[PDB]
Amino acid sequence: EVQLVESGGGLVQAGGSLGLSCSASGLLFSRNSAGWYRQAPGKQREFVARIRMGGSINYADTVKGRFTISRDNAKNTVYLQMNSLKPEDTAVYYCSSWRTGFYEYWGQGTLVTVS
Amino acid sequence: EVQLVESGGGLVQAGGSLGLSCSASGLLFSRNSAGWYRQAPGKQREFVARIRMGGSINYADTVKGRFTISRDNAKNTVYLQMNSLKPEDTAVYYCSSWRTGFYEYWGQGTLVTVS
Amino acid sequence: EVQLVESGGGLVQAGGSLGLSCSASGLLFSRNSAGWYRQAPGKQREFVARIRMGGSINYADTVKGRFTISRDNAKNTVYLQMNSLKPEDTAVYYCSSWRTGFYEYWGQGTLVTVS
Amino acid sequence: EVQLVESGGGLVQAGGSLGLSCSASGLLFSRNSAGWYRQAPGKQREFVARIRMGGSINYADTVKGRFTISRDNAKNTVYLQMNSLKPEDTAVYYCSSWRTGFYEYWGQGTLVTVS
Amino acid sequence: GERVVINISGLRFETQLKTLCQFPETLLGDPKRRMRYFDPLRNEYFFDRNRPSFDAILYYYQSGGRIRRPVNVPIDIFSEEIRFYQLGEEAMEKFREDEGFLREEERPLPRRDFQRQVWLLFEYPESSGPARGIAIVSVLVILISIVIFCLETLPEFRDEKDYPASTGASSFSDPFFVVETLCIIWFSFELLVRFFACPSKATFSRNIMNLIDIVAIIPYFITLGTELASLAILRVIRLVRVFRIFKLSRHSKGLQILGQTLKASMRELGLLIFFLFIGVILFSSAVYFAEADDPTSGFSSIPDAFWWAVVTMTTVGYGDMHPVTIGGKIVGSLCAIAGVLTIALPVPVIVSNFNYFYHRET
Amino acid sequence: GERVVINISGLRFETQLKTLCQFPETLLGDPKRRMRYFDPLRNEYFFDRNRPSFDAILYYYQSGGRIRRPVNVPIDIFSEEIRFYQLGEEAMEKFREDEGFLREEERPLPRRDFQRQVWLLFEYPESSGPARGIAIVSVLVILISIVIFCLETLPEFRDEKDYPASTGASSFSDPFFVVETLCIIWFSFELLVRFFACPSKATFSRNIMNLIDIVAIIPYFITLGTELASLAILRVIRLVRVFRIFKLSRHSKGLQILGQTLKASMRELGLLIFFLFIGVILFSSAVYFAEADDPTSGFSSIPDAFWWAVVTMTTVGYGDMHPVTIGGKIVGSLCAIAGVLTIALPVPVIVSNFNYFYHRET
Amino acid sequence: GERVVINISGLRFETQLKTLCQFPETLLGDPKRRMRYFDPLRNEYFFDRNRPSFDAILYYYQSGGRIRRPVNVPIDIFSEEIRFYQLGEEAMEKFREDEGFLREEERPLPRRDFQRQVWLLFEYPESSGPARGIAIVSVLVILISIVIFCLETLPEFRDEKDYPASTGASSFSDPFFVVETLCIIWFSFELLVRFFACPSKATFSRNIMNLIDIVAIIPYFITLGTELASLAILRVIRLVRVFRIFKLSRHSKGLQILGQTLKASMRELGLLIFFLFIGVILFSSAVYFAEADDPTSGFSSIPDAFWWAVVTMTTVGYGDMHPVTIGGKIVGSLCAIAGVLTIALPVPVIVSNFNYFYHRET
Amino acid sequence: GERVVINISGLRFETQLKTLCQFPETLLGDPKRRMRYFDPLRNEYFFDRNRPSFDAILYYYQSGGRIRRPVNVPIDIFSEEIRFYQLGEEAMEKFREDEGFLREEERPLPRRDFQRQVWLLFEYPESSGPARGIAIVSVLVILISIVIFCLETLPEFRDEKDYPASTGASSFSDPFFVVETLCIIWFSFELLVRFFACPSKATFSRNIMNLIDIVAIIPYFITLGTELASLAILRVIRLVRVFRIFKLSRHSKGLQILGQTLKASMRELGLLIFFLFIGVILFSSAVYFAEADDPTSGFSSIPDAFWWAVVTMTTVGYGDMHPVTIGGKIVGSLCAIAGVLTIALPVPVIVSNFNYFYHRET
Ligand SMILES: [K+]
Ligand SMILES: [K+]
Ligand SMILES: [K+]
């Protein structure tokens, strides 16, 4: 009934520049909190970014100053602009949007591995 | 009073990629069901795709996985993205939008024949 | 207080193809009738096209089948697509929008002369 | 809570052509007056342009006929189109939007110096 | 003319003998009955009874029939007083007539042994146990018929018939059709028994709820007939199937009172719609002529401000558009005020009629 | 002063002879008439009549003229009682005056043989057959005139004149013009006959429906005159053509009652508009000063929240915008409540006046 | 039967001795008491008292008990009159019964020394100083409980728990939890003392405000129990915590009168909702069938015009969409009018019941 | 005790001599006055006067002072009757007291020759010609003051001061300032003369319209003082300048009646706002919990559905959003109905108070 599809993946070399996108239908993002989560090989998922509804953006220590998460608030679209990618980034990424206490929805995954 | 005009036709070779479009005025597509119908030479029309209002898409066996029907829901536009065209496709195509029990409207036709 | 500004002019040769535009502020075109008028050198202005509010388009005999007048109904814009220009066209053009019995407004003029 | 960010700066030579932009969030520009202010090195800021809410544009003597200030009234964006830049222009520029008697907000600055 | 002195509790009332003999079968007129109360010692007929009432019972004798209750004698004390004086049932009905109380309870059961027994079963639901069972079954059948009329139009159920027409079926595959035929079977059987067991077949096409049953049966039969035997009739017949909601009025005493209220108040509803039409013409014309000059305004006709005038006068809402001129705003505030002023005027008559018919059940 | 004892049904009423001779032509005063009822045996005038009434008919004699009905005697029994006592038509009109009933039916037909006959034909429509024919024709002419005023503004009919002005014509090609001239011909002929056949030509410019006929004729004549003989008058004259809707009041008794109600209640309507103006100033100022600081708010003036205040107080709808601050929301809920509180106050007076004038036809 | 003549101020009232001895303990019946007023000179009992009243006090003797006040004697002058005549307290309560005045003041304090003293402290707040202190503390506790129920849902406070669920805590770190537990502590202590100090423990589960206290305590206990011991119950339990707003009715006499008004008027509210359902089916069906053909219309079902029909009939506002056909506009103006016509009909009954229960406190 | 028989028109009323001597200065009590009417032939005092009234004038003698009008005697006939009987002005005021009619007309002109003459000029505008001139000038000054308060906020006038603040002036260049100072000059002069010419200087700070004059003068003086001598006070002072609209109540008798109505009805307005707060909490909580699960819904808090609940209950309009779930739609139709049900309950009390104070001017 609802779906979270994403693109922009692949492989990159050192000092790259890329932009994954997450889009959905059955769920206006204008009304729900959202973020991008990554899962390095060998440990559990960590968070790249969070844009709680209302324009409050917070990022984890690893991606600070190299990453931006924006909701075009149009076309039910959230876009992440990653920058100067480093080999520690190598991972599989996932997208999400949820209301605390009621529902949680995920994407299928789309990976970016840095050479 | 109402009209259904379409473009994108011609001829293609094997393994092609193309996208016909259907646009109308006097009929918001936001409110009515729509589909694309083709007519091979020698038999009656069969259906390429149907997007019943509300985002429920169904396709016939011949075009499964090679065709997508989308209503940009903007500009009163329905677009079909055909892919990897095969010689069995050779045909004349038509567009439509109707309300069951009340009215039925057609396009003039626009053909795509695969070499 | 209101103004009708237009562009797209110049000179063209035989069999040309061009598109003048008329834009305004202080006057939504969504609500008022509009047309494009030309003035050949030596006689009074004749009409190239008229789009009475409600999508009823009528053209004079000289430009039939070579000209299209469209209101994008967005950006308060009316655009004329002239085609296969001929030397008899040589003239100065003007734009207008009016309500019968109340007001009439003109553009400054922008010319297209065919070689 | 509110911010006024701007781009388009750098250096230019004689007879240049450029366009700075001012965008904001936490402040619809549809509802507030706005202008672009510059500060030459050695004296206090002077005004390049002012577009008081309601489309009344006024410019200072130095930039008359070489500058245009427009609010796309979309995307909370005000854009200035500078033209034929001269060496007297060399300066640092700033953006603003205010309501007389209640609040005043500034940009960070973005410079254009003419060679 | 000899005079008679009647003393009701110390209060001496006197009249000519002729006046109390006009009605001779009554207590005062009948010589023998009145003789009991007579006291020969003082030549007066002593009675011990209410003082304010015996005044009205002497007017009836002196006015040839008028019987009017004094406004300070309560109903019960008067009803008893006509009884002691023996004024007759014709008199007491006239007193009920002057207090205007409905007096009609005409229920002619046929009394042919079986026609009367099943008529008692099907008409008066309080009589038995199976009568209330039949009332409950009829109300549940009507409710599922309404649910089929609305759920037949939902796009989700008709997923496979949602195809272009160019490519009521008796195939019995559509579940809506077979449950619809079961409802019309029950309505037909119930109506035919209420026809054949009624005690008055000439009056059966006079009661309005019977004509509701007939016009609820009709369109399914004519569509079945024409299907197994038009395009103008089909859109009308599909909306005459909405009258099964009014067939729920035989089992409610609130819908029947709203029908009496809306019948007895048609002049007021005509005045309501007439005042609305006057105001709509006046205010839509004034807003069209006070906003046409502005190049950004949206009223392009006088028959284009009609919907704005209707939804502004009845305090509903948006209208097609909203005034943008100073003049359109002055004719839009006057329109908002005059709307409630001209629709609140005939309404107290209607609510007073409802209140009367609503307490007359008691 | 000698005393007279009158016994109405056992109840002895006594008075001085002078009091009942104040009015000498009346039944009690006239010596001969009263002599019939007199009984010489007990020196009392026995009458058999209602007891509660004869009390009021002795006050008239002792109070020099006042006639007031006791509140427990019904109207009919009293009207008859003044008749038996012979108090005179001046007395019975005063009783009607005290029950406040309209008494004016002054219809001075001229009685000049032809002027009277055609006046009976054209004024009172119930009199004949052709009178109802003339009423039906006049109502249908007024209705098609309204239909021409609205259908002349529709953009679909004027397809070929929809060209820029820089490029009421007597060319008789426009069908709206010739059907308009037929309507004004009928109005003019009917008004001129009602002028020349009236029995009072001095009072003809006093009745309001006659001045409605004149101001409905006027603008077509002045536009024809100035066309075959301005730009300020033309937009006013095009809106004085809307008064043909009020010329439909000669044939309705509901519009005439709304005219009486709106005349007799002007102080209340003035209070209504005054209270609205007070509330609009107060609440628009409070919402402007409680939402101006927010950078995303839309109220840019105090004379810009006026329309929001009007449509919120009258419970219509959107307003130009809606509050976005906590403070704007508290001044917007108080505005919504105070609106219905301050407009429901003068309205019961208006509906009571309507109800009075509406039942006075009966 | 010997007769007795009683003269109240010149007005002679007479009756048989048997009638005034039916009630023997009363003033007239008791031979000794009545003997004082008796005057042997004229054989009549002279009294100086109101004339219009002594008529009703003879009906009581002649009618075996009925006591009805004449409509022209004011209440105070009558109450005094039953007292002088000595008709007994049973009689005066019946007079109060006929003027229908509430007579119940049953407050059974237990009188066990301590149970009675603390019951006086906790139930009747006007009695002391600490009683009003306890009333003020209880009202402030209820108010901060409502403020915690609404401020617990605000997104700003929960900034750090706004993370996906896949990654009422007794950690005592959440301030809402500890202030919530303080409120439920106060409610529990107050309810348990009102249980153990009541003078009637059998009737304690009968008063409705006690059952409001219990259902306000319940959901915090069952969520604490199941947390330190479901997903269907959790969304219901989170909405049964809204009944602490009704626990503010023990301290208001306006909420208690609205509860009496809404209990005594359930037939009218049922009629209101029934009429609304009828109109919603009828008008939504007519607008669906009068606008479906237009290719730019938006009504796609009959159960899709229901919300439009509800907000248009109740004069609220937009609806899901708005008619775009001439036919949809005629069925939308009739819908707007019939809405206020069918919802204003049962409302005067409800406001009359409120007005009665609102002045009966006086 | 000797007895006295008074015969008012045949009706014999009797009493003990002591009762009519309780009040000795009255007509019946005074031996000499009463002696005129006495007739020695039958030992009775014959009077010819209304029968229903003399009953109430004997109760006053027998009840020590109570004077109550029978409900079937009209006011005028009674007022005259107390006069003939000579019951005294204390008695007639008590009769006016029982019909509850306002009796206060206390206008203490100082009578010091000049203070009284100019007080007559400035207070009572009907007295002279210049008094109406002064009333007309004061109303026009108040009107142009309101026009300056609103036109000072319009963006068009302030074209050159529309610059960023970082770059009430006594420069006398701003025209709004000098016309504002002229208005405050007129208000100050008029208030100071009404102070120094009043006949009661102790009561001058008690009348509410005087305190309206003072709080209309205040903010211009404190802003002039602090300007030629804060940022928290400035936004409050700019909204205390809106009270010059209430200074227009000395010259209107409709605003003064709305002030009396809103003073005498504060318990009802408190009940109105209390019922609204209850309904807003209840319905906003139910719509938040019945629409939160849907991913496309917009209610993100319980203190975010408050504005939707307010504008839906008061039948205004849109709300912040609209329900999109089947459950939100059922809690939104119940909200629409319960709104008018709970706000129409205390309003008839307020309109009845207005109607009383509105006709008491007559
Ligand atoms: K409303
Ligand atoms: K509304
Ligand atoms: K609305």
Author numbering:
A (entry chain E), B (entry chain F), C (entry chain G), D (entry chain H): 2 to 116
E (entry chain C), F (entry chain D), G (entry chain B), H (entry chain A): 103 to 269, 287 to 348, 359 to 491
What does the published report state?
The Kv1.3 channel is a voltage-activated potassium (Kv) channel that is abundantly expressed on T cells where it plays an essential role in cell activation. Potassium (K+) ions leave the cell through Kv1.3 which makes the cell membrane more negative (repolarized), and thereby sustains the large driving force for calcium entry that is needed for T cell activation and proliferation.
Next, we solve the structure of Kv1.3 with the recently-developed nanobody inhibitor A0194009G09 (Ablynx/Sanofi) which inhibits with nanomolar affinity through an unknown mechanism and has 1,000-fold selectivity for Kv1.3 over hERG, Kv1.5, and Kv1.643. However, Tyr447 adopts two different rotamers in the density map. The second Tyr447 rotamer has its hydroxyl group directed towards the extracellular space and so it is distinct from both D1 and D2. For this reason, we designated the conformation with the second Tyr447 rotamer as D3. The structure has two distinct conformations (D1, D3) distinguished by different rotamers for Tyr447 which is a critical residue in C-type inactivation.
